[PDB]
Design an enzyme around this catalytic site. Structure first.
Site, PDB file in Angstrom:
ATOM      1  CG  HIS A  43      -7.153 -39.377 -32.426  1.00 23.15           C
ATOM      2  ND1 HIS A  43      -7.824 -39.184 -31.235  1.00 23.15           N
ATOM      3  CD2 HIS A  43      -8.100 -39.325 -33.395  1.00 23.15           C
ATOM      4  CE1 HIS A  43      -9.129 -39.094 -31.501  1.00 23.15           C
ATOM      5  NE2 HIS A  43      -9.322 -39.204 -32.802  1.00 23.15           N
ATOM      6  CG  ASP A  99      -5.937 -35.405 -32.226  1.00 22.38           C
ATOM      7  OD1 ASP A  99      -5.408 -36.049 -33.135  1.00 22.38           O
ATOM      8  OD2 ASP A  99      -7.047 -35.753 -31.751  1.00 22.38           O
ATOM      9  CB  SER A 204     -12.281 -39.676 -32.513  1.00 26.23           C
ATOM     10  OG  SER A 204     -11.818 -39.662 -31.176  1.00 26.23           O
TER      11      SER A 204
END
Lengths: 257, 29, 10
Positions: A43, A99, A204
């Site tokens: 992502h 991910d 993230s």
């Protein structure tokens, strides 16, 4: 990092900033898992529905990093990818699975008191440690409070550290409503637990390294992927199974570096 | 050498929030 | 969907 505290000079020498060149900025963080290899959330590199999509050139990477503001004149690092590498079975479409993404540092970095690698698990370690209640520590420079904005309450001056417990897989499926796969894991204390902290915006890609009491090493058990906010009494972050996909991780290293 | 922070382990320094880590694997008291 | 979400960021 929601409810955490400021790092210390040398305590996560494998945390990297995923800083795009211009709009000169920071989309995420990753970790040093070789002389020249860095891994992260996917992502963090290829999100269509928000037409996020970069290439080596697009970004530039930095290390040695304490203060999230300045220019760490001679403790910091930076090199640009030679090639980004994502995982050919990634769900940006469904729940954002596998991910994971890696980047063959265009060139190689040489370590020091301030830049030093993380090691990847082994079922042994992948298994003594990845357990309900056994805390893990998540770092970064992400958003001090739910997606909002303040050199305060927005983002930190310096690097944020939080340590969180693993969540009984059942309970995990009942924080969300997203089809969660045996490949993602959840961190974070309970509503009732009476203590809070979590990972937030631009956290993230950022690591989920734990420490093995066997060899006193640091094992990157996770990779930051998602949440439905920041520090909700009722939910837990969701991280990537760095070991489940440790398989892949290997192949691209041994096939292009 | 990996997993071994050269400003702590690598010279037995103990980061102020790491000890808190341990007491979960063997659960405190 | 990254952690602040569906809709894009602030």
């Amino acid at each position: 990092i929601v409810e955490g505290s400021d790092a210390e000079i040398g305590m996560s020498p494998w945390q990297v900033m995923l800083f795009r060149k211009s709009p000169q900025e920071l989309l995420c963080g990753a970790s040093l898992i070789s002389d020249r290899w860095v891994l992260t959330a996917a992502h963090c590199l290829l999100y269509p529905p928000w037409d996020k999509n970069f290439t080596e050139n697009d970004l530039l990477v930095r290390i040695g990093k304490h203060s999230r503001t300045r220019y760490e004149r001679n403790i910091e690092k930076i090199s640009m990818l030679e090639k980004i590498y994502i995982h050919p079975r990634y769900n940006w479409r469904e729940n954002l699975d596998r991910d994971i993404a890696l980047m063959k540092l265009k060139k190689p970095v040489a370590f020091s008191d301030y830049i030093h690698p993380v090691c990847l698990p082994d079922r042994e370690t992948a298994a003594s440690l990845l357990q309900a209640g056994y805390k893990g520590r998540v770092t970064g420079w992400g958003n001090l409070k739910e997606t909002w904005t303040a050199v305060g309450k927005g983002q930190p001056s310096v690097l944020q550290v939080v340590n969180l417990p693993i969540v009984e897989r059942p309970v995990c499926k009942d924080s969300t409503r997203i089809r969660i796969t045996d490949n993602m894991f959840c961190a974070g204390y309970k509503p009732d637990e009476g203590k809070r902290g979590d990972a937030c915006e631009g956290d993230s890609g950022g690591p989920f390294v734990m420490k093995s009491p066997f060899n006193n090493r640091w094992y990157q058990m996770g990779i930051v992927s998602w949440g439905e906010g920041c520090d909700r009494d009722g939910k837990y972050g969701f991280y990537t199974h760095v070991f489940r996909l440790k398989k892949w991780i290997q192949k691209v290293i041994d096939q292009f570096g | 050498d990996c997993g071994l922070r050269p400003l702590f382990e690598k010279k037995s320094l103990e980061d102020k929030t790491e000890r808190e880590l341990l007491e979960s694997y063997i659960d405190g008291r | 969907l990254d952690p602040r979400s569906k809709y894009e960021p602030f």
